[PDB]
């Protein structure tokens, strides 16, 4: 079967300002088939109340989903997105970089 | 509004 | 000023894990407005945009009845396509469909669409004439014969030229404050030293709607297509989109670089440089 690996982007809704409430986003796209596991991490630990968009797809048939949660960025707290898909041998962790 | 006719493939 | 309506259907089998899941989502341009999921606690068509909420109970019931019928039809289609490809009863398979209408800035129908895929590969599509089909292989040729006997293309053409355009125009009016409002990108250029002799220039575009945008870097007025790192346009989660384009420039040579931004929400296109 022809399978496509997810592209992953980790970023904030609004420009990041330490101590100011924002939204941490993990955008997964360009993947096929549709089953995917996505978690948002705070210092390596899974964040509980994470919401996601409804399953949709692009003109090339590849699926996309947005996972998001309210967060307050700080200087020391590390945020990341952990993704698993049939195409991956092990979960892929992409760290949040506010310059990305 | 979606298309109202469902046709099996 | 151009607008489109699309419905996206995903039917996915999961042998040993119950019946195939059917999800339908409806969009006006880059705004989702409805969802139906056969896996929901109580499956019904649900609003996903505030301007659709004003629709009466008959609208919601009509949608739910269509999608409930589609859930059953797509389960039969998955069984049929498994057969057409001599596939085992073991594997999970996906049927996807995307259809809808495109309007010009005059509100006139530009063209209609109706495409289907099997396991992410083109399977069958309605041609631009809205009268004939393009079948990808001998399996899709079986679907084509079935669809001709049921007169599907003629039914789709009536829908695409009629109800599709009529409802899209109604949604555009009811949601004119958002759907017909183009939000320009908020732009800036960041500078990131990568070494002693090189630095990254990153051109940002934030808070824009619709998603369509052009972000390019030019060195001495010539496009840097091969040297530009361009991220996929991404949703902010509040209806708006984000995108960035980056170039690795020789340190000291930053003023030879210009970022060009083209978007519908802008009074005039933008030319930006790094401002130290």
Which backbone phi and psi does B7 adopt, to 5 degrees? -125, 120
Contact at 8 Å (CB) between C204 and A99?
Answer: no
Mutate to test the interface with C, among A34, A63, A67, A71 (most CBs of C within 10 A): A34
The burial of A23, by beta-carbon neighbours within 10 Å (0-12 exposed, 13-18 middle, 19 or more buried), is given as: middle
Q: Tell me the DSSP string of chain C.
A: --EEEEEEEEEE--TTS-SPEEEEEEEETTEEEEEEETTSSS---EE-SGGGTTS-HHHHHHHHHHHHHHHHHHHHHHHHHHHHTT--TTS--EEEEEEEEEE-TTS-EEEEEEEEEETTEEEEEE-TTSS-EEESSHHHHHHHHHHHHTTHHHHHHHHHHTHHHHHHHHHHHHTHHHHT-PBPPEEEEEEEE-SSSEEEEEEEEEEEBSS--EEEEEETTEE-TTT-EEPPPEE-SSS-EEEEEEEEEETT-GGGEEEEEE-TT-SS-EEE----
Q: Helix-strand-coil percent breakdown of chain A, rounded to 5?
A: 0, 50, 50
The burial of C96, by beta-carbon neighbours within 10 Å (0-12 exposed, 13-18 middle, 19 or more buried), is given as: buried
* Separation of alpha carbons C37 and C10, rounded Å: 10
The upper half-sphere exposure of residue C223, i.e. CA atoms within 13 Å in the direction of its Cβ, equals 6
* Separation of alpha carbons A35 and A84, rounded Å: 9
C8 CA to chain A: closest CA distance, Å? 7
* Separation of alpha carbons C29 and C2, rounded Å: 9
What is the torsional sign of CA C21, C9, C63, C26?
A: positive
Contact at 8 Å (CB) between C218 and C262?
Answer: no
Tell me, what DSSP letter sits at residue A47?
P
Tell me, what DSSP letter sits at residue A53?
P
Q: Do residue A15 and residue C238 have CB atoms under 8 angstroms apart?
A: no
Angle at C77 between CA C75 and CA C78, to 5 degrees: 65
Among partner residues A54, A57, A62, which is closest to C35 by beta-carbon distance? A54
The burial of C100, by beta-carbon neighbours within 10 Å (0-12 exposed, 13-18 middle, 19 or more buried), is given as: buried
* Separation of alpha carbons C116 and A32, rounded Å: 15
Angle, helices C138-149 vs C152-161, to 10°: value is 70
In sequence order, which residues have a C-beta less than 8 Å from that of residue C79 and are 6 or more positions away? none
In sequence order, which residues have a C-beta less than 8 Å from that of residue A25 and are 6 or more positions away? A9, A10, A11, A12, A13, A66, A67, A68, C234, C235, C236, C237
Angle at C219 between CA C205 and CA C224, to 5 degrees: 70
Q: Do residue C120 and residue A32 have CB atoms under 8 angstroms apart?
A: yes
Contact at 8 Å (CB) between C189 and C272?
Answer: yes
* Separation of alpha carbons A65 and A79, rounded Å: 19
In sequence order, which residues have a C-beta less than 8 Å from that of residue C238 and are 6 or more positions away? A13
* Separation of alpha carbons C201 and C247, rounded Å: 5
- CA-to-CA separations, C171 to C113, C161, C181, in angstroms, rounded: 19, 16, 13
* Separation of alpha carbons C258 and C269, rounded Å: 13
Domains of chain C: 1-181 (3.30.500.10), 182-272 (2.60.40.10)
* Separation of alpha carbons C74 and C94, rounded Å: 10
Q: What's the resolution in A?
A: 1.8
Q: Do residue C206 and residue A99 have CB atoms under 8 angstroms apart?
A: no
Integer Rg of chain B from CA: 7
Tokens of C141: 């040729």
Q: Do residue A61 and residue C10 have CB atoms under 8 angstroms apart?
A: no
Q: How far is Cα of residue C247 from the mean position of the Cα atoms in its chain?
A: 28
Which of these, A70, A95, A100, A75, lies nearest to A83 by C-alpha position?
A95
Strand order from edge to edge, sheet including C121-126: C46-47, C31-37, C21-28, C3-12, C94-103, C109-118, C121-126, C133-135
Tokens of C49: 């945009």
A32 Ramachandran zone, left/alpha/beta (phi>0; psi -120 to 50): beta
Domains of chain A: 1-100 (2.60.40.10)
In sequence order, which residues have a C-beta less than 8 Å from that of residue C263 and are 6 or more positions away? C182, C184, C185, C205, C208, C212, C213, C214
Question: Which H helix or E strand runs over A95?
Answer: strand A92-95
What length is written for chain C? Answer: 276
In sequence order, which residues have a C-beta less than 8 Å from that of residue C51 and are 6 or more positions away? C33, C171, C174, C175, C178, C179
Q: Do residue C63 and residue B1 have CB atoms under 8 angstroms apart?
A: yes
Which of these, A53, A91, B5, A1, lies nearest to C94 by C-alpha position?
A1
Residue with tokens 């006719």: B5
* Separation of alpha carbons C192 and C202, rounded Å: 8
C120 CA to chain A: closest CA distance, Å? 6
Which of these, C138, C140, C134, C95, lies nearest to C118 by C-alpha position?
C95
* Separation of alpha carbons C204 and A81, rounded Å: 22
């Amino acid at each position: 079967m022809i399978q496509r690996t997810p592209k992953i982007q980790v970023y904030s809704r609004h420009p990041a300002e330490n101590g100011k409430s924002n939204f941490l986003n993990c955008y997964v796209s360009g993947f096929h088939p549709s089953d995917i596991e996505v978690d948002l991490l705070k210092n390596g630990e899974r964040i509980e109340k994470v919401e996601h968009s409804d399953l949709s797809f692009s003109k090339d048939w590849s699926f996309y989903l947005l996972y998001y949660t309210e967060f307050t960025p700080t200087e020391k707290d590390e945020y990341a997105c952990r993704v698993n898909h049939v195409t991956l041998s092990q979960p892929k962790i992409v760290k949040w970089d506010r310059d990305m | 509004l979606p298309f109202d006719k469902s046709t099996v493939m | 000023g151009s607008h489109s309506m699309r419905y996206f259907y995903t039917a996915m089998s999961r042998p040993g894990r119950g019946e195939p899941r059917f999800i339908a989502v409806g969009y006006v341009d880059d705004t989702q407005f409805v969802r139906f999921d056969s896996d929901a606690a109580s499956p019904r068509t649900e609003p996903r945009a505030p301007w659709i909420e004003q629709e009466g109970p008959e609208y919601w019931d009509r949608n739910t009845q269509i999608f409930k019928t589609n859930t059953q039809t797509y389960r039969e289609s998955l069984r049929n396509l498994r057969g057409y490809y001599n596939q085992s009863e073991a594997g999970s398979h996906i049927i996807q469909r995307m259809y809808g209408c495109d309007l010009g800035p005059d509100g006139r129908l530009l063209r209609g669409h109706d495409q289907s895929a099997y396991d992410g590969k083109d399977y069958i599509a309605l041609n631009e004439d809205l009268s004939s089909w393009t079948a990808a292989d001998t399996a899709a040729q079986i679907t084509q014969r079935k669809w001709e006997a049921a007169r599907v293309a003629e039914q789709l053409r009536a829908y695409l030229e009629g109800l599709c355009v009529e409802w899209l125009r109604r949604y555009l009016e009811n949601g004119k404050e958002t759907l017909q409002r183009a939000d320009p990108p908020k732009t800036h250029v960041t500078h990131h030293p990568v070494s002693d002799h090189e630095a990254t220039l990153r051109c940002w575009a934030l808070g824009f709607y619709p998603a369509e945008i052009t972000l390019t870097w030019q060195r001495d007025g010539e496009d840097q297509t091969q040297d530009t790192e361009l991220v996929e346009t991404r949703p902010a989660g509040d209806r708006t989109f984000q995108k960035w384009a980056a170039v690795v420039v020789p340190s000291g040579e930053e003023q030879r670089y210009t970022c060009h931004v083209q978007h519908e929400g802008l009074p005039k296109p933008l030319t930006l440089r790094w401002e130290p």
